[PDB]
Design a protein around this ligand. Structure first.
Ligand SMILES: Nc1nc2c(ncn2[C@@H]2O[C@H](COP(=O)(O)OP(=O)(O)OP(=O)(O)O)[C@@H](O)[C@H]2O)c(=O)[nH]1
Lengths: 75, 82, 69, 660, 241, 80
RNA sequence: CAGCUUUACAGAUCAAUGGCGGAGGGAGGUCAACAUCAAGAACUGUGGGCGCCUAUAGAACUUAUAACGAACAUGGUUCUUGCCUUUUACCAGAACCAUCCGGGUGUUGUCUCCAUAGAAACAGGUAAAGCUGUAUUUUUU
């Protein structure tokens, strides 16, 4: 078995490309690299980029995305 | 402890019905439940708000997104109540 | 308190029905008490793939229908 | 009327749960547990069963005042005149009880209180076969005897969930007068012994497999149950499981809010002793000794239980029992433990395979059921059958096969790999063995045991009944092997009827005995002398009683108790002597090899090699039964006369049966 | 005053327990309920007469049932009684092929001890034979040196702002509890602490002794007497009026 | 509609209860059992749904209604 | 330290509804009368379905090494025995039977010894007894 926390830790260690989907919001996504870790799914993510979904790119700085509104993580 | 949860647990085995917040009704053999209503079913149909049915083998469902669970009338008779 | 009994669904391909009428696919790798799924990545519902391995949050899950019996 | 008895009418003991619900539950598998409770002689399995029954039911007619009070044990399931008068549970007269768990939800449970005594181990074996979990009840005092070990081994062999009941704490509390610490130590020792006899699975009071019982005084409890009852008020929901885990394994309280694995100097005893055993002791002593008012007050305070004004005036032992009952609530803890033990239903398949052969599952295609033991439950013949798959309806036309004709059938099937329905019968009436009454039912579903009336007359002992609808289905099907009644029989009692006039009657009686008592070989010899090869002395006596009173009522002569002797050879055969109107050698096998035997040609050869390190040619030739038969001349490999030797081997079997 | 503290005041009174008390029904004197210590005292007093074996297994082949069996089978358990046989011994075997000394083997002597233990087996043509008991062993140790919960006669094993239940008890074993324990294992009369009153006639103090196996190194006459008593008892038991 | 002046929800067990929900549906049924988190067990439940005109009716039976989705509970009628 | 249910409390409007209501004894007698205590493990009614099923219920007592007795006598009858030779009076076993010395339980009725109130809950307090409680993903932040 591989827990979610463990996975998160691994991702952090890596510093590989991550693409986050927002909760209750289909049209917008985020794409960055995981820097932080918390007890909840909340993580700080430098080099983030906002993406409008194909139903391309937009300018965006360094961000911490809150745990409550996460959907997807991948790295 | 939650009496509805207990009831649900008891219903384990029976052909229960199950609607979500989305409004998509399921009907089938109840496999397993937990403290939070983390239901599983077997040999289960799935009808959307439109009415188009879709059959499926094994479904798991999370209690938060569950609206209400219909049990057969047999468990009205006994015995966890008193 | 109790762990989600998903040992039957371990290492099987599952259609995770998620918030906003969306869907995810993939083979099941791991899980925890909050129902945060860990699964090998697949296509989002014609169809197109993103990511290698994926970790889905518990709150977002509407359902998870087993593709493999 | 009758002397050996059941209820005989529909004024049955009414039940606290409604029976309809139970019936409904029995429809669906996964919500049925065949328990089959087992132990040594007078461990108290029957007592436990009785207690369970009492818990289930409202007001039972058979239970007098004295029994209710506590004094005499209600031995419920020993319903036979003999099993009463003798004191032994002799036959399988279990129960079907809707029993709740710690999780309030409830499940139907086919208990079977086997005999403890070691000559009815056939009965025990049968119970094991029936049942999917097995409660191994043990006398705390006597501890894990060899018998217990044997039972455990048997259970392991025929795949079953072993949920232990360490019974008769009262004896250590009061009879021995062990200090609480001493008692705890004893318990630990017992547990260790159990573990040792077991192959792998570690049993302890944590995990809810060991169950601490005192079935005379009328309480069973797993530590989990205790915790639920009495350590919820204090300890919050998060650490309750943790607390439970802590309790047993040599941890202490440290006079402080969290526990520690090291020994502490201020406090004396471990957590189990402090949080359970000590409390129990206190309860006991107070019940026996303390001022009544004070005791009542304590109950009101600590356990939150009130003694009735009538119950105060009780006599000591009865009072104690009552107190225990009040404290340790109607035995759900045990049920919970059982459930926990048998949370794996993947064992079921394994068990089935063991019973018959490595099976391809075909549930919807056909009904099939292991007829285990015939019984004379309510005077009339019923048959204790476990429906394994399908549903067995009343008035169904059903094919049956005695396990005698199982191996042969299998062979035939293999060979095959026209409809040859050899025998069959109609199901007259299905009923649930509910101890003293048979509550009747129309259906009978997968994974549950039941009494059926029509089957008995087909077979002798242990049948397989099935209702197919196809050739493919038939092909798929398998046939349960004959029950290995662990105790082999070597107590040879020879009969003759005293009045030859009524030889038919005697024969009938013998047949009945064979049907009912499974651990009974009945050789009808050439000399007009019937021979019974019973298991032991007591068992034999019981059988005789049954015959010479209930299943015949005849004056019958009986020999001195002999044994089945068996011929062998010490050295190897010296003379190569042929026979005419064949020459075969003789030499004993290896002792270890023999023992192994007691407990594909290439594969066989390999096995032989592993066992004794014999020659390969010998292995190749070999083809044994019952012992060993080779075909090891020179010209047999060239010759076709020696080839095709099944018929030849049949002849040998006769020789084996009846030696020189 | 020290040992027999409770009983002394009433023990030797015409009406053994006083009128107008909570320990008996009343002046009708039909029922009684006792406290523990008084009961204990009584038990202690009665050591001579109530001398009974707390071990139930002691009575193996001295059961009423066993006696009955013996009577049926015309088979004296040597200690116990003997009667006229139920059935006349019709010695008409006529040298048959069954039960011959040509046929059977004599490793065991088949004692008549074994007959009444497994009547239906070892005895051939048993008639009106009741079934006997077949029991567990009684490890029950009572301390005679005035000590409390001790492994004496046997051997040791090889190897959040709260407290346990019944905290603030401060003592496991109450001062009266040894006595209580003793009472517990004792037989019918004292086991209980409430009862219906029997007539002085309807108490039997001799009975118990004769039911027991006789104390060894007694004269022959005494043994005979004991046997007679047993016979008298047994007959009474057998034919219920 | 008539009903006694009740104090708590636990005291009015087995009364015929109307139950309003967030989606718009109205579940009528007798309250068999309650929860700390307002989950209700209903005896002979009937779902009344109002689409965007007139009350569409659906008979259910024994039902376990979750507390999250309930808006409020009105007493429709007495027991029996 | 919250909540609801009951007593002990004023003064209420006193409807509303419950519950204690034709609201009135208790303890006992070597006191009665009756009933009933060996039968399909066996109880009694009630309607309904039509001598039997299905719901209601009730149930005091006695029983599993089977009994009202943790107790034990004596008769009568046959049959077999024994001392014996006549019988009674006896021996000891059997089978039926009875008698007796006792026992409960229930209902009345009495006898004795102690005693005496015909109305209180609601709005909620005052005080005390019964149980429950101690916002970051599945309930209410
Ligand atoms: N001290 C004590 N005695 C018990 C306990 N449980 C049963 N007994 C007694 O010991 C014997 C065991 O009870 P039974 O139920 O007869 O034994 P069993 O389990 O039927 O034994 P089998 O006849 O072999 O099945 C009986 O004589 C009971 O009175 C117990 O917990 N403590």
């Amino acid at each position: 078995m591989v827990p979610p926390i463990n996975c998160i830790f691994n991702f952090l260690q890596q510093q590989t490309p991550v693409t986050i989907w927002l909760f209750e919001q289909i049209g917008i996504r985020i794409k960055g690299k995981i820097v932080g870790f918390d007890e909840f799914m909340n993580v700080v993510i430098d080099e983030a980029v906002e993406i409008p979904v194909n139903s391309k790119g937009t300018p965006l700085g360094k961000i911490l995305l809150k745990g409550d509104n996460i959907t997807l993580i991948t790295s | 402890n939650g009496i509805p949860v207990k009831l649900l647990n008891e219903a384990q085995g029976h052909i229960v019905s199950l609607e979500l917040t989305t409004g998509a009704t399921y009907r089938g053999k109840l496999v397993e439940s937990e403290d939070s209503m983390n239901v599983q079913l077997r040999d289960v149909i799935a009808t959307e708000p439109q009415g188009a049915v879709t059959h499926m083998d094994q479904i798991f469902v999370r209690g938060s997104q569950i609206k209400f669970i219909v049990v057969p009338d047999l468990l009205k008779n006994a015995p966890l109540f008193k | 308190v109790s762990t989600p009994e998903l040992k039957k669904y371990m290492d099987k391909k599952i259609l995770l029905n998620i918030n906003g009428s969306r869907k995810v696919a993939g083979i099941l790798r791991g899980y925890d008490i909050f129902l945060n799924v860990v699964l090998d990545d697949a296509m989002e519902i014609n169809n197109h793939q993103l990511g290698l391995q994926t970790v889905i949050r518990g709150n977002s899950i509407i359902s998870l229908e087993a593709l493999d019996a | 009327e009758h002397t050996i008895f059941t209820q005989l009418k529909k004024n049955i003991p009414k039940t606290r749960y409604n029976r309809d619900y139970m019936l409904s539950m029995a429809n669906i598998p996964e919500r049925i547990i065949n328990v089959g409770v087992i132990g040594p002689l007078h461990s108290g399995k029957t007592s436990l069963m009785d207690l369970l029954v009492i818990d289930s039911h409202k007001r039972i007619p058979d239970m007098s005042k004295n029994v209710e009070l506590g004094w005499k044990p209600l031995r419920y399931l020993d319903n036979l005149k003999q099993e009463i008068d003798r004191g032994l549970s002799i036959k399988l007269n279990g129960s079907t009880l809707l029993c709740t768990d710690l999780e309030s939800k409830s499940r139907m449970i086919n208990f079977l209180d086997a005999p403890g005594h070691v000559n009815f181990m056939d009965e025990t074996a049968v119970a094991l076969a029936a049942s999917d979990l097995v409660l191994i009840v043990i006398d705390v005092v006597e501890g894990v005897t060899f018998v217990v070990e044997q039972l455990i081994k048997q259970s392991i062999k025929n795949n079953v969930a072993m949920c232990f009941v360490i019974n008769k704490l009262d004896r250590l509390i009061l009879d021995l007068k062990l200090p609480p610490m001493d008692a705890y130590l004893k318990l630990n020792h017992i547990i260790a012994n159990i573990n040792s006899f077991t192959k792998g699975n570690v049993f302890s009071p944590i995990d809810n497999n060991i169950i601490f019982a005192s079935t005379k005084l009328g309480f069973t409890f797993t530590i989990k149950e205790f915790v639920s009852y009495y350590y919820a008020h204090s300890i919050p929901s998060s650490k309750i499981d943790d607390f439970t885990t802590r309790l047993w394994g040599s941890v202490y309280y440290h006079k402080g809010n969290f526990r520690t694995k090291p020994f502490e100097n201020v406090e004396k005893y471990p957590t189990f002793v402090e949080f359970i055993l000590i409390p129990l002791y206190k309860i006991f002593s107070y019940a026996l000794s303390m001022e009544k008012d004070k005791l009542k007050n304590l109950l009101r305070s600590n356990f939150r239980v009130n003694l009735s004004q009538e119950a105060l005036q009780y006599d000591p032992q009865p009072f104690l029992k009552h107190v225990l009952q009040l404290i340790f609530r109607q035995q759900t803890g045990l049920v919970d433990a059982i459930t926990r033990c048998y949370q794996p239903f993947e064992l079921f398949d394994n068990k089935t395979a063991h019973l018959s052969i490595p099976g391809k599952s075909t549930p919807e295609g056909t009904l099939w059921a292991h007829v285990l033991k015939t019984v004379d439950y309510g005077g009339a013949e019923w048959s204790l059958v476990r429906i394994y798959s399908g549903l067995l309806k009343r008035g169904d036309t059903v094919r049956i096969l005695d396990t005698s004709q199982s191996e042969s059938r299998q062979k035939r099937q293999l060979h095959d790999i026209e409809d040859d329905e050899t025998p069959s019968c109609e199901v007259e009436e299905i009923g649930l063995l509910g101890g003293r009454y048979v509550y009747p039912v129309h259906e009978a579903h997968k994974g549950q045991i039941v009494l059926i009336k029509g089957i008995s007359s087909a077979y002798i002992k242990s049948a397989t009944l099935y209702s197919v609808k196809s050739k493919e289905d038939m092909k798929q099907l398998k046939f349960f092997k004959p029950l290995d009644y662990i105790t082999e029989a070597v107590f040879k009692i020879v009969l003759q009827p005293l009045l030859p006039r009524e030889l038919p009657k005697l024969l009938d009686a013998l047949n009945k005995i064979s049907k009912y008592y499974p651990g009974v070989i009945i050789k009808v010899e050439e000399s007009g002398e019937h021979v019974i090869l019973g298991n032991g002395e007591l068992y034999m006596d019981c059988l005789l009683y049954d015959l010479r009173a209930s299943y015949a009522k005849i004056e019958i002569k009986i020999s001195d108790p002999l044994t089945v002797f068996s011929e062998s050879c010490s050295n190897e055969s010296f003379a190569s002597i042929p026979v005419s109107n064949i020459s075969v050698a003789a030499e004993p096998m290896d002792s270890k090899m023999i023992q192994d035997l007691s407990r594909p040609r290439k594969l066989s050869k390999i096995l032989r090699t592993e066992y004794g390190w014999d020659s390969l040619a010998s292995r190749n030739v070999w083809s044994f039964y019952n012992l060993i038969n080779d075909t090891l001349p020179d010209e047999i490999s060239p010759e076709l006369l020696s080839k095709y030797k099944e018929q030849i081997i049949q002849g040998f079997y006769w020789a084996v049966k009846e030696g020189p | 005053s020290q040992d027999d503290e409770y009983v002394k005041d009433w023990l030797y009174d015409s009406r053994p327990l006083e009128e107008d008390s909570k320990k008996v029904n009343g002046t009708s004197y039909k029922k009684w309920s006792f406290d523990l210590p008084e009961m204990s005292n009584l038990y202690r007093l009665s050591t001579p007469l109530r001398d009974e074996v707390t071990d139930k297994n002691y009575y193996y082949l001295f059961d009423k049932k066993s006696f009955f069996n013996g009577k049926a089978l015309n088979n004296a358990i040597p200690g116990g009684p003997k009667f006229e046989p139920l059935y006349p011994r019709e010695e008409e075997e006529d040298y048959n092929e069954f039960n011959s000394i040509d046929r059977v083997i004599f490793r065991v002597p088949i004692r008549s001890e074994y007959k009444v233990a497994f009547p239906h087996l070892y005895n051939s043509r048993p008639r009106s034979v009741r079934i006997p008991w077949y029991n567990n062993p009684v490890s029950c140790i009572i301390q005679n040196d005035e000590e409390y919960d001790t492994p004496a006669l046997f051997f040791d094993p090889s190897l959040e702002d709260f407290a346990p239940l019944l905290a603030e008890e401060e003592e496991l074993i109450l001062p009266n509890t040894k006595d209580a324990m003793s009472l517990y294992h004792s037989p019918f009369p004292f086991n209980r602490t409430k009862g219906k009153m029997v007539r002085a006639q309807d108490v039997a103090l001799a009975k118990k002794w004769f039911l027991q196996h006789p104390d060894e190194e007694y004269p022959v006459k005494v043994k005979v007497s004991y046997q007679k008593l047993l016979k008298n008892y047994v007959l009474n038991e057998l034919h219920p009026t | 509609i008539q009903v006694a002046h009740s104090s708590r929800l636990a005291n009015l067990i087995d009364y015929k209860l109307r139950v309003l929900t967030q989606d718009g549906r109205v579940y009528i049924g007798q309250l068999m059992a309650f929860d700390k988190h307002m989950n209700l067990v209903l005896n002979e439940c009937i779902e009344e749904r109002v689409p965007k005109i007139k009350v569409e009716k659906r008979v259910l039976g024994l039902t376990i209604l979750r507390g999250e989705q309930i808006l409020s509970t009105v007493v429709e009628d007495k027991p029996l």
